[PDB]
Amino acid sequence: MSPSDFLDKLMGRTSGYDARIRPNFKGPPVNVTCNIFINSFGSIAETTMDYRVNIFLRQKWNDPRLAYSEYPDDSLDLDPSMLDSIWKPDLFFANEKGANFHEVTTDNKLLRIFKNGNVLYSIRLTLTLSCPMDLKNFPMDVQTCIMQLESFGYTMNDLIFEWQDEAPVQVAEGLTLPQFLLKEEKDLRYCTKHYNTGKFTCIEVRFHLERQMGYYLIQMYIPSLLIVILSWVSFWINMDAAPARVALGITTVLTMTTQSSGSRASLPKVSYVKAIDIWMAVCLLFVFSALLEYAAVNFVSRQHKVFIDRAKKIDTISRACFPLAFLIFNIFYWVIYKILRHEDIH
Amino acid sequence: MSPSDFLDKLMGRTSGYDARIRPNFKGPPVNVTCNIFINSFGSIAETTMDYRVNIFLRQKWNDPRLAYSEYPDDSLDLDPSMLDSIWKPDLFFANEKGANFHEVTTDNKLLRIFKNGNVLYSIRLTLTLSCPMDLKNFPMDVQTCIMQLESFGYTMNDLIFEWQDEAPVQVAEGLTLPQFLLKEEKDLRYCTKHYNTGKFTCIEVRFHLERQMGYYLIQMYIPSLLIVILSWVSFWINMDAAPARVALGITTVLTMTTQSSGSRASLPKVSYVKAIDIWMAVCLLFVFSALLEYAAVNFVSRQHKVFIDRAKKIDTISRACFPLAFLIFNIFYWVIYKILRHEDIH
Amino acid sequence: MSPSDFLDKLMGRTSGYDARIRPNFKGPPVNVTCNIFINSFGSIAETTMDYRVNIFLRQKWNDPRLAYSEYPDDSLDLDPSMLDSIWKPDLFFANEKGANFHEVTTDNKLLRIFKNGNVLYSIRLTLTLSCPMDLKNFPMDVQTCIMQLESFGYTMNDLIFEWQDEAPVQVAEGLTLPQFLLKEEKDLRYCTKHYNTGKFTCIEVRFHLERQMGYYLIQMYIPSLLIVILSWVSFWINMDAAPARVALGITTVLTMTTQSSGSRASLPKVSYVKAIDIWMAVCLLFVFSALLEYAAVNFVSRQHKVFIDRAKKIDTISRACFPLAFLIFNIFYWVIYKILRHEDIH
Amino acid sequence: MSPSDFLDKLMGRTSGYDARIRPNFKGPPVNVTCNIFINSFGSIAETTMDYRVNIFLRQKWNDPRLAYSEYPDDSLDLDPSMLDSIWKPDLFFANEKGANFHEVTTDNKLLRIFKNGNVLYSIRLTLTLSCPMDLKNFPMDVQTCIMQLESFGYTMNDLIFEWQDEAPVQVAEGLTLPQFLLKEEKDLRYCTKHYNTGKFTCIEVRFHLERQMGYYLIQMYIPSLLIVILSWVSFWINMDAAPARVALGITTVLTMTTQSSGSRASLPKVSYVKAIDIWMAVCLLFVFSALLEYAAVNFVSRQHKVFIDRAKKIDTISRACFPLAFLIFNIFYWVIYKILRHEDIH
Amino acid sequence: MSPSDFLDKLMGRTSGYDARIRPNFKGPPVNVTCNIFINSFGSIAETTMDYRVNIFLRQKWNDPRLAYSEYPDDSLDLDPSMLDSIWKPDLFFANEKGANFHEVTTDNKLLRIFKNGNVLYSIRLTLTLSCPMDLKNFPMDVQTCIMQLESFGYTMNDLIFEWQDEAPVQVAEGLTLPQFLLKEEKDLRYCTKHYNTGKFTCIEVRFHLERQMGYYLIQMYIPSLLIVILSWVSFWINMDAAPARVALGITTVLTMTTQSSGSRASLPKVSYVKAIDIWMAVCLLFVFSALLEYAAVNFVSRQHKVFIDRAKKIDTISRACFPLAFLIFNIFYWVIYKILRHEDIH
Numbered sequence A, B, C, D, E: 001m002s003p004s005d006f007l008d009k010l011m012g013r014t015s016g017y018d019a020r021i022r023p024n025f026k027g028p029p030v031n032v033t034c035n036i037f038i039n040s041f042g043s044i045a046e047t048t049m050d051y052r053v054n055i056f057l058r059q060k061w062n063d064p065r066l067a068y069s070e071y072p073d074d075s076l077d078l079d080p081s082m083l084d085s086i087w088k089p090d091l092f093f094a095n096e097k098g099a100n101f102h103e104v105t106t107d108n109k110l111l112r113i114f115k116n117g118n119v120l121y122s123i124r125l126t127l128t129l130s131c132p133m134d135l136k137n138f139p140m141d142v143q144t145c146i147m148q149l150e151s152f153g154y155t156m157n158d159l160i161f162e163w164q165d166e167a168p169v170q171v172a173e174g175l176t177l178p179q180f181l182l183k184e185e186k187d188l189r190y191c192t193k194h195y196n197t198g199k200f201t202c203i204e205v206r207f208h209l210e211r212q213m214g215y216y217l218i219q220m221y222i223p224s225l226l227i228v229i230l231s232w233v234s235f236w237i238n239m240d241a242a243p244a245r246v247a248l249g250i251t252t253v254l255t256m257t258t259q260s261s262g263s264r265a266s267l268p269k270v271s272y273v274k275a276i277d278i279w280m281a282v283c284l285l286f287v288f289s290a291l292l293e294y295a296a297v298n299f300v301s302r303q304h305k306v307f308i309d310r311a312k313k314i315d316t317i318s319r320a321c322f323p324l325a326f327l328i329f330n331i332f333y334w335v336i337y338k339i340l341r342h343e344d345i346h
């Protein structure tokens, strides 16, 4: 025939096609097979508990009214503007905060109609999805980001969503994240929303992201350790140098206070302790105990010669005991925090 | 019949339906039963005095012109695009700063028409609602967020809003807030706007949110207490160490000044004192009195031996009196601030 | 008759009504009576010199072509969607930076047509209006925010704007501002724009806002005073304690420098001095003169015993003279700044 | 006749008017006379190198097909909605980053048709125009902001842009800028874009803006000078006070480092030196040389009495030489920077 | 003929033209020749790993159905509004985060139809393109920004994209960047996307940008060097001045810590070391070793005269060895970092 006539013949007034009626109106529910292709991944903000994604959302379903045989071609890669003249599933993202299409030059849309009536519907989307994050074990945590594909108007008696058996989630090659590693395996679950308006279909993916500790070591693990070592210099400073040892205790304690507040600058105001909070608390306790060590030496040395060697013994004991107890803490902290991270994500 | 014909028969030119006319035009006012489902809750900013919500707004009313009997089906879950061909209430949010719909894939809308003429109208909305906050008792406060549903064009003689008798407000399971606890009980009030243009219907919910103090203890309650203890080390420092005790008083006072200004960084510029302001003022008064204590010891010790034991007596008295008076203040501050919080929200 | 027929009969093709023609086309100019209702007030930013408002804009004018008598009803509260089929004034805000309507559920619009032809047109608007601010006397200033309602296309020969005789401006009950007090009285002026395109009508309101000083006292008035008192401790510190008195002068001067820069953090980069700048300059001069006082005592004490009592006399004189001169400055500063604020706003 | 009939008679199907055809299709090019009225000016950000303006753009051209004689009126101030039914020039701004119209109540548009066929077309626009800035001589610089009005689709053979002979640029009375002075004179140039698609018309204005130095004197010129004077106190401090003079050198050098980094906080990361960078570098060199002066006095004083008066001579020489050399630098810096600013803008 | 009739004759119902059908429907694929003109370049943010561009995108292809001979004119520069009535390629940008058109006064679009059927289609676009950046060698790095032009709906059997043989990329004259130099040469590659939906055409440019080091030298290369020199003053400070040398070591170490954290303020949280991180680590190691040098001198000097000249020998050796080893590090650091930058970009 001609390319234009076939398009407006299969659907329209002459054929009787109605886009407001689901394909099998009073029969079995429509089964929509979905699969996504992640084009980009980033903007993971813990303060707002969300992340931004850019995906190619593909949907496959069978429409018996769109089946054709006369036209010679097998598939039919048609124009996007007609997408309003056909029935489409009312998919929506349950945990979506913001979303939009793309019209950079034309509509970033695709539609194919096969001979048997199968419809492939691909679309480009930018999504801002909410992600509740557990920040206990914060510099060393594995977050799980979810993506729920839910129907809004049709129940399970009308619309059912299914993930493709092969490759429901595909990630673009070379897609890296500056802060996390995206695990190769993905979890495909079966959500089902139960409202007072009825039952609604839902499908869900889970992405596992491990936080990289290279930034946090050079940002607040090594500089705080350096402050603890800098506090240990006072044990070798001469005893009568009171403005020297006291200023050494003070600058280290106040710096540890500012570094402790600086470790939560980019984090939400949660109300539970974290692993970095435990490390900051122990380092602050160590520098404060070093200052209390000199406050005791300064008090013991003036009680009037037993008191000259008794105060010097505290300095000699603190020279070896302060790094040994800090090493024992470092062993227990790092070992138990590399033990909890081997726990299964599931 | 056929699915398409019934939809355009009940309403349209042939039936005579007009979407610009309320159902009972010159009779009793239309009663709209409303109930909301909170999908997300967050973005509670004290600086802008607002919070962001994402709800499913359901509206129920009876339209006698939409009653049908011939079609076999009980309910009629129809397509959203037709929503312009029917009459809908002109609901609007009185305390709304910004609002928008959702069109992530299709319209996030739902409409059902029953046999008797009842219309269920569900919609997805993102709202930025203004919330006036009282920050007296700030680290330990219970805020009340409101949501007013008001008609804009119709008076009480035409439109009346009512909350559903069962479950007007439903919260999604597992919805947590990083900063607040959402109380299970909700207050359903009856606002009524009186303008010079007439009387207008209004309904209102109240959400009670208790601020969690876990963040604020580790952020500005314990570090300021540590500065007060660090200031108490000077009482044990040797008397003639003037650059040591003076630098101890100075660094503690200047740090208390910076922490006091740091406690109001994320707060609006209100003009009344708060509980954290009282705590910061007392801690600043304590470290400043410790420095004045050494300024008196340094002045008394040089008046030329009575003056050697008289100045030492002030040090010995301040060693026990400074923590005892600080403990008495801590008891009165915490007790009275755990007494005011047991006061009923209502 | 029927409700629908009357609406499309009064205006349309059959009646001959044209929305592109002003009511009295070649007669007296159309007089539009305007009055606003402020729903919210806030977002007053000095850096961008603007403020955000949310108002109900009401407009009243007479259209002889819309007069009816046959229909029984007195007023006619009709549907908003028809608002395009009638003539409306081309009002616009002269000092508007950004503006938008509201479509949270439906159009936030209202239109009534009376028997004689009077048209009441209410609309909801969010406005970001520019406000030039004079920040001399900044912590204690009264700003005047303006709102100009101007016609864009019609001259005085066609369109005239007037304020309602009773209640042109109404403020919602309980509307408070965290930073300012909104004065109860308002000024209704008569602007008139003179361009090269002709003469254009304009009406203007003026809002008077007094800045509350409760925040600024605890933020940068009392902490700077505390630094000045902390600088006065050096006069009581022992004379030979050079690292003590010198470090006392240095930390106070550098802190006064940081507080002076901190007082202009949220302010625009204006090029005239302010009241807080005068207070910061005098406090910085006081702490710098205290350090120069010890620099003179340290120089006088070593000139080799007259020089021992001569240097001690400067300390004794500075003990009483430094707070007395600071008290005299505080009296003159506060008195003259409570005198300028009693000056009439007009 | 009637007002409505004339509007649709001059243009439309009956007359044969086509909005897709330029007035003189195959004759001389259309000459469009342009003039702008600046309503607001601000948001000048050096980091993004742009500024925001709000203008009334007026365009005048002759359309022979719009000439009328029968209708009685001289000019014809018509309704804005019809603006799509006539031909308009395809003006666009070459250096525009973002732009939008205004629809606060209606379209902020104006169109007049005269008897001879002249068309006056006024529109309200908000523009974010890019401005390349030269920041050498930064606290004391005169920037030149440009505005290019270019045609996008028509060449010089079809469309020519011209500035009005009288008042091409008019500024609203009382329009001030918090950071700059807008020079009264303006430069009207003749740009002409040469692409591979052909030749295109362009016209350009230039605004000269002088930066006000009142903010920068009190922000980083006087506080850095105060640090230099504070560093000169060490020359009067006693020689053996090593922790006093050393702490005086250290706090001044570290403060000069922080003030130097603070001077470029709101500036883009350019790679050439500026006048404030030269001032910061010389002030940092002065305080660092004062510390090296005490490092030399402390080294010379202990070489074992010639060495007691030799080290004291360096202190006495540095007491007068350090302010004299700083005064000579201040004279040469300010004189040459008030000489370069008298250079013609052109 | 007449200008209007020809436009609607070549395409439309009478001619049979369909915009939903590609020109050669069942023949060879359509070859689209593309070339871009960069109007502006900037907003290069490393934190979000993106950059903003403003380009003129030109597309050339042959449409046999648009060939004409009767009309006299060679080319046909027509009106933009008709652009919907013709077939256009479905180009889209693969690495695009956000994009929009421009409608400042009219559509910023251009279309020309030649006699043989060639179509030139120019459009103005603002793009926010993602750019993965390697920040190893960060203050001295050459980034490569890419721009992929990909088809969304048509495969290689239908649509093929090609770069123009002459001048695919043209940069506007005088276009400078405050932070980078845009290399004159550009790389034109051949991407080809392989999805599960089929094969898709793609073309790609590469821009090479060299970071300018003028800002980073005065921002964090020279101030850190000054801290290292300031730490070398302690070697000349007198030995028994313990509060002087200790405070000199402390302020320098804490300042180096704050400058090290300040060097990564505007950078993303990557987990690999950079060149500035290596420089900051070595400078921190140098000032910390200077403090350990005085901690050893202070310990050796009190062991009770051999111990008086033995501790003085460490001071004399450290006076020359500390700058010599720092000079050797500076030679190896700068030489190897000027060697890696001569490596070919390709």
Ligand SMILES: *[C@@H]1O[C@H](CO)[C@@H](O[C@@H]2O[C@H](CO)[C@@H](O)[C@H](O)[C@H]2NC(C)=O)[C@H](O)[C@H]1NC(C)=O
Pocket (backbone or CB within 6 Å): A024, A028, A029, A030, A031, A160
């Ligand atoms: C959609 O999928 C469901 C589930 O596989 C199909 O329902 C089954 O259909 C088969 C074929 O008639 C029956 O034998 C089963 O008993 C059905 N199971 C259930 C639970 O209903 C359904 O037919 C599919 N829809 C379409 C249009 O093919």
Ligand SMILES: *[C@@H]1O[C@H](CO)[C@@H](O[C@@H]2O[C@H](CO)[C@@H](O)[C@H](O)[C@H]2NC(C)=O)[C@H](O)[C@H]1NC(C)=O
Pocket (backbone or CB within 6 Å): B024, B028, B029, B030, B031, B160
């Ligand atoms: C909407 O609700 C109101 C209040 O219940 C109804 O008004 C009452 O209607 C009953 C039934 O006719 C009367 O007996 C009462 O006297 C009415 N009370 C008032 C205060 O008006 C109203 O009828 C309802 N509207 C509809 C359409 O059912």
Ligand SMILES: *[C@@H]1O[C@H](CO)[C@@H](O[C@@H]2O[C@H](CO)[C@@H](O)[C@H](O)[C@H]2NC(C)=O)[C@H](O)[C@H]1NC(C)=O
Pocket (backbone or CB within 6 Å): C024, C028, C029, C030, C031, C160
């Ligand atoms: C709009 O208001 C103006 C001013 O009150 C009216 O103009 C006056 O109209 C009266 C009644 O005819 C005359 O007596 C006056 O001489 C007019 N004054 C001026 C300055 O024109 C005008 O008529 C009003 N418009 C309408 C439609 O009522």
Ligand SMILES: *[C@@H]1O[C@H](CO)[C@@H](O[C@@H]2O[C@H](CO)[C@@H](O)[C@H](O)[C@H]2NC(C)=O)[C@H](O)[C@H]1NC(C)=O
Pocket (backbone or CB within 6 Å): D024, D028, D029, D030, D031, D160
């Ligand atoms: C637009 O302006 C140009 C330049 O003034 C006009 O071109 C001139 O027209 C006059 C009158 O016919 C001629 O004598 C000149 O030789 C023309 N000069 C050039 C360079 O073309 C043009 O006619 C104007 N267009 C209209 C419609 O008036």
Ligand SMILES: *[C@@H]1O[C@H](CO)[C@@H](O[C@@H]2O[C@H](CO)[C@@H](O)[C@H](O)[C@H]2NC(C)=O)[C@H](O)[C@H]1NC(C)=O
Pocket (backbone or CB within 6 Å): E024, E028, E029, E030, E031, E160
């Ligand atoms: C688009 O370009 C391709 C590649 O040059 C063209 O394909 C070639 O066409 C010539 C001419 O018929 C043949 O001789 C070659 O064998 C073709 N090569 C391939 C790989 O197909 C194609 O014809 C061009 N399309 C149009 C419409 O001109």
Ligand SMILES: [Zn+2]
Pocket (backbone or CB within 6 Å): A101, A102, A103, A104, E096, E097, E098, E099, E100
């Ligand atoms: Zn896009």
Ligand SMILES: [Zn+2]
Pocket (backbone or CB within 6 Å): A185, A186, A187, A206, A208, A345, A346
């Ligand atoms: Zn898993």
Ligand SMILES: [Zn+2]
Pocket (backbone or CB within 6 Å): A096, A097, A098, A099, A100, B101, B102, B103, B104
């Ligand atoms: Zn959405």
Ligand SMILES: [Zn+2]
Pocket (backbone or CB within 6 Å): B185, B186, B187, B206, B208, B345, B346
């Ligand atoms: Zn309650």
Ligand SMILES: [Zn+2]
Pocket (backbone or CB within 6 Å): B096, B097, B098, B099, B100, C101, C102, C103, C104
């Ligand atoms: Zn709204």
Ligand SMILES: [Zn+2]
Pocket (backbone or CB within 6 Å): C185, C186, C187, C206, C208, C345, C346
């Ligand atoms: Zn007034």
Ligand SMILES: [Zn+2]
Pocket (backbone or CB within 6 Å): C096, C097, C098, C099, C100, D101, D102, D103, D104
């Ligand atoms: Zn506007």
Ligand SMILES: [Zn+2]
Pocket (backbone or CB within 6 Å): D185, D186, D187, D206, D208, D345, D346
């Ligand atoms: Zn000029």
Ligand SMILES: [Zn+2]
Pocket (backbone or CB within 6 Å): D096, D097, D098, D099, D100, E101, E102, E103, E104
């Ligand atoms: Zn634009």
Ligand SMILES: [Zn+2]
Pocket (backbone or CB within 6 Å): E185, E186, E187, E206, E208, E345, E346
């Ligand atoms: Zn290359």
